[PDB]
Design a protein around this ligand. Structure first.
Ligand code: ID1
Length: 244
């Protein structure tokens, strides 16, 4: 039916219409596909921002710094967003992208064990510097869209070097949507303290029949852009390609 020239044009147009520059990478089996209106972003490094929450949670659970039902208490200080002003589990923090919880979890892990775990997993440029609580927000940790989709593919298939149960626990935190028998698992990201600002949505689709299709959207966020544009472009793309 639909030519690949048309698929490429439809998906480029989604990014064009949002007046941003971005790419979305799809992986089917071993094969990577790059779509969007800025294909060269695919092998450029950007801060992972909140997408790091996935690995942060993996490391924390594996090293017994937390459990999946522990409540991280709000310390009562004003937060950037009122939705963060409450007690929550890692899983709720994952859905709300509650940075203060992931910061508390990074601190419990500590710089030393974090650096080793990040090197061990080979995540991005694997460099976390000297500040345990912000390396994924302002650098020096960086990662490419290709690396992110490969990380997602790894997690989707339990290939990261953590126990199966750790991986399963983190994955259950990432379920964001069901669409005609397809389950979408994803982590969003928005690096507000870098110039320019980077937007992420990294995840996979689990189809009815069990096949898992990893994706990673990467784009430039601009002042007065809605966060849900990351989702809308992703769903439109995955739908255009008949993945969902
Ligand atoms: C991670 O990338 C972010 C951190 C650097 O600030 C958080 C902040 C949110 S913005 C709106 C929050 N609403 C969530 N339900 C965000 C994001 O949308 O990814 N990531």
């Amino acid at each position: 039916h639909i030519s690949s020239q048309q698929h490429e044009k439809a998906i480029k147009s989604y990014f064009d219409e949002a007046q941003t520059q971005g790419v979305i990478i799809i992986k089917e089996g071993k094969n990577l596909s790059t779509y969007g209106n800025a294909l060269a972003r695919a092998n450029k490094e950007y801060v992972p921002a909140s997408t790091f929450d996935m690995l942060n949670a993996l490391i924390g659970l594996e090293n017994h710094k937390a459990t999946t039902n522990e409540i991280f208490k709000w310390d009562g200080k004003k937060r950037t967003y009122p939705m963060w002003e409450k007690d929550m589990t890692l899983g709720e923090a994952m859905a709300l992208s509650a940075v203060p919880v992931y910061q508390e979890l990074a601190r419990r892990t500590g710089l030393e064990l974090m650096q080793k775990e990040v090197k061990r997993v080979n995540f991005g440029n694997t460099n976390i510097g000297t500040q345990v609580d912000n390396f994924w927000l302002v650098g020096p940790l960086k990662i490419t869209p290709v690396q992110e989709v490969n990380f997602a593919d790894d997690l989707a298939h339990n290939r990261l070097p953590f126990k199966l149960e750790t991986q399963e626990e983190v994955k259950k935190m990432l379920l964001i949507k069901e669409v005609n028998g397809s389950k979408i698992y994803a982590k969003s990201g928005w690096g507000m303290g870098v110039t320019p600002q980077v937007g992420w949505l990294t995840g996979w689709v689990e189809q009815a029949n069990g096949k898992k299709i990893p994706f990673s959207l990467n784009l430039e966020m601009k002042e007065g852009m809605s966060g849900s544009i990351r989702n809308e472009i992703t769903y439109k793309s995955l739908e255009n390609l008949g993945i969902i």
